[PDB]
């Protein structure tokens, strides 16, 4: 019985592998023959935001491309006015271990998650004042690796218990639980249409989920180590994954296969955070060698090096308008690059 | 005008800077510790994470117990790299080999190669009664224990036969073999034996943290 089911599973795996191989006419390298090179990018630190006492584990941008939420292990959620290097809000956190922070698309809310297994949403705009907890979303068995707002009264969370969840904030109860990963989910990137979200786990696999139906449509398996960061390509049905194998890869949601492998002989350090530019031409990846990296997505070749951090580059985000890169790192400093 | 908004931003930033200065003092006052391997140590010290506070000689220590998570540790243990020490409790009675590889992984982890590990040998009386029995998990799963002699420097710890001493220090040197190899003053693995009837564990962690901070001072004060 069990052996028969395992044989059926092997047959199905071979079937999907054969289908993918048939659909594998070429790779993303097929366009790396005629596209003009992007040229050497040279972005300097346009500001260093020095308010954090510990490693900046995660950070996020607001839709205004001006405000900046940054999280660190001292127990702070600082909102930075990147234009004038001013700390608009300093939100103390109940639990100092925070691995993610999110900014609501319409402002007014900030969500932080970490080892506490809880996602807490803070009311930035307040009739009274004193930005405080609005809803303390609990229910995840393990820690929280990434929280992504989609609007008020809805949040999508990825946890280390191999499950992703969509929460209704006002009621405080889960709406849909996503299951199918066998490892700790690390990163979550919602689609621009905000109807799908991909997640990378510690089982060398990434899965596309439908936020409404609640099941996994496609499972992507191309890596040989834990996926540490994931990020949707702006739009075009693609996403990029950075792993601990010192390799970045680009997956297409429609072809259901990997397309590129951003790796080099020199690099042996994993990618902690991954992000994309507005055009999607540049893929920016933060490594463990205390140095961020710039990748031409269409032409796998490297085209930039954002050195300037003395420790692990933990988080890395690109503005919605595409005007800046705010790279947090364990050096307790956050730098904005043009 | 925009000058009013600029003044408002300056005032808000001034308040945040004062608050962050106070928080800077607080953060440099308290020391963070990670406990790996027990609730008994938490009981004698006085939810995905358990935050517990204690003070000895007016110094602030924070210990963190990962007590509602999975068995996978390769990702959430990286967050505990700025901690002063990683307290490691072992049964020290194959539990022991699994403990040895957990310790080895912590020692050889890229982000824990600056963090010393206060090994404690959480239980010792079970080891005493095991070697009294003889056929328990002392000699069968570790043949070299029979072919090993108690080192001279080992304190007798009165109240026990030489067999208890040799088995105890055998597990201690089994844990110290990984510690000595591929390890320098960056992290030292202070070895200790745990007494559940006494509160010396807090004092010993205090002394180890004192030595750790003294080493970081020697390094940052260029006394080397």
């Amino acid at each position, epitope marked *: 019985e069990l052996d028969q089911l395992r044989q059926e599973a092997e047959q199905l795996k071979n079937q999907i592998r054969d289908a993918r191989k048939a659909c594998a006419d070429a790779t993303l390298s097929q366009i790396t023959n005629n596209i003009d090179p992007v040229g050497r990018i040279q972005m300097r630190t346009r500001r260093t935001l020095r308010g954090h006492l510990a490693k900046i584990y995660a950070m996020h941008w607001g839709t205004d491309s001006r405000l900046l939420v940054s999280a660190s292990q001292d127990g702070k959620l600082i909102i930075w006015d990147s234009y004038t290097t001013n700390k608009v809000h300093a939100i103390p956190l109940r639990s100092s271990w925070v691995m993610t922070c999110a900014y609501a698309p319409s402002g007014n809310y900030v969500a932080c998650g970490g080892l506490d297994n809880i996602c807490s949403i803070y009311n930035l705009k307040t009739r009274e004042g004193n930005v405080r907890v609005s809803r303390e979303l609990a229910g995840h068995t393990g820690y929280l690796s990434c929280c992504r707002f989609l609007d008020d009264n809805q949040i999508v969370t990825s946890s280390g218990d191999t499950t992703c969840a969509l929460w209704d904030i006002e009621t405080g109860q889960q709406t849909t639980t996503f299951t199918g990963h066998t490892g700790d989910v690390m990163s979550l990137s919602l689609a621009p249409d905000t109807r799908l979200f991909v997640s990378g786990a510690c089982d060398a696999s990434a899965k596309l989920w439908d936020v409404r139906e609640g099941m996994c449509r496609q499972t992507f398996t191309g890596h*040989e180590s834990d996926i540490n960061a994931i990020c949707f390509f702006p739009n075009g049905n693609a996403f990029a994954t950075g792993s601990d194998d010192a390799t970045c890869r680009l997956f297409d949601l429609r072809a259901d296969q990997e397309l590129m492998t951003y790796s080099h002989d020199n690099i042996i350090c*994993g990618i902690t955070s991954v992000s994309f530019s507005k055009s999607g031409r540049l893929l920016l990846a933060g490594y463990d060698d205390f140095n961020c990296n710039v990748w031409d997505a269409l032409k796998a070749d490297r085209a930039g090096v954002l050195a300037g951090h003395d420790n692990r580059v933990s988080c890395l985000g690109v503005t919605d308008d595409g005007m800046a890169v705010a790279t947090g790192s364990w050096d307790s400093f956050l730098k904005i690059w043009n | 005008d925009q000058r009013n908004e600029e003044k408002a931003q300056r005032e808000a930033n001034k308040k945040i800077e004062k608050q962050l200065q106070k928080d800077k003092q607080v953060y440099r006052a308290t020391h963070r510790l990670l406990l790996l391997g027990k609730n008994t140590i938490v009981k004698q010290m006085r939810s995905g994470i358990f935050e517990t506070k204690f003070q000895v000689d007016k110094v602030n220590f924070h210990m963190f117990d990962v007590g509602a998570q999975r068995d996978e540790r390769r990702k959430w243990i990286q967050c505990f790299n700025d901690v002063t020490a990683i307290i490691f409790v072992v049964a020290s009675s194959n539990r022991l080999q*699994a403990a040895l590889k957990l310790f080895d992984s912590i020692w050889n982890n890229k982000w824990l190669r600056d963090t010393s590990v206060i090994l404690f040998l959480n239980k010792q009386d079970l080891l005493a009664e095991k070697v009294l029995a003889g056929k328990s998990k002392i000699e069968d799963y570790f043949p070299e224990f029979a072919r090993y002699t108690t080192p001279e420097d080992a304190t007798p710890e009165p109240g026990e036969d030489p067999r208890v001493t040799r088995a105890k220090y055998f597990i201690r040197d089994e844990f110290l073999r990984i510690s000595t190899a591929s390890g320098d003053g960056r992290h030292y693995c202070y070895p200790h034996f745990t007494c559940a009837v006494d509160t010396e564990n807090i004092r010993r962690v205090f002394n180890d943290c004192r030595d750790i901070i003294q080493r970081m001072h020697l390094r940052q004060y260029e006394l080397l």
Partner: nanobody, 126 residues
Framework: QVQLQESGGGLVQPGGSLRLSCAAS????????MNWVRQAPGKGLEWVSD????????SYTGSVKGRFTISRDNAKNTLYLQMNSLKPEDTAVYYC?????????????????????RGQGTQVTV
């Protein structure tokens, strides 16, 4: 995907000998500290052996000390194990486990019940 397909085993009387290899088709096989872990009937996963990237660094536990050999043939992408002087101790599903990350010498988790790269073990009844 990362595949660890065990082979060999069957049945053998006490004092016999077997061998078992693990084909790998997902990772490099040269920069991972591969190792053997077993679950005896009625017990959890317990460590047996371990070989490093070069193959020079080699470790065992007490029960398998001197009676087990690890080969780590890089060309064949198969981690072998020469089982000698067998006792009823094994009677387990021997499966191979890979290091979580390459270019590291700290296999942090191998004994977890749901670790991603452990394979489907083959029974060795003795």
């Amino acid at each position: 995907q990362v595949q660890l397909q065990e082979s060999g085993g069957g049945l053998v009387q006490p004092g016999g000998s077997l061998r078992l290899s693990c084909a790998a088709s997902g990772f490099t096989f040269s920069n991972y500290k591969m190792n053997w872990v077993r679950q005896a009937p009625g017990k959890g996963l317990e460590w047996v052996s371990d070989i490093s990237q070069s193959g020079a660094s080699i470790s065992y536990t007490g029960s398998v000390k001197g009676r087990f050999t690890i080969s780590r043939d890089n060309a064949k992408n198969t981690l072998y194990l020469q089982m000698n002087s067998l006792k009823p101790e094994d009677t387990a599903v021997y499966y191979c486990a890979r290091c979580p990350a390459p270019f590291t010498r700290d296999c942090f988790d191998v004994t977890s019940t749901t670790y991603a790269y452990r394979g489907q073990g083959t029974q060795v009844t003795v």
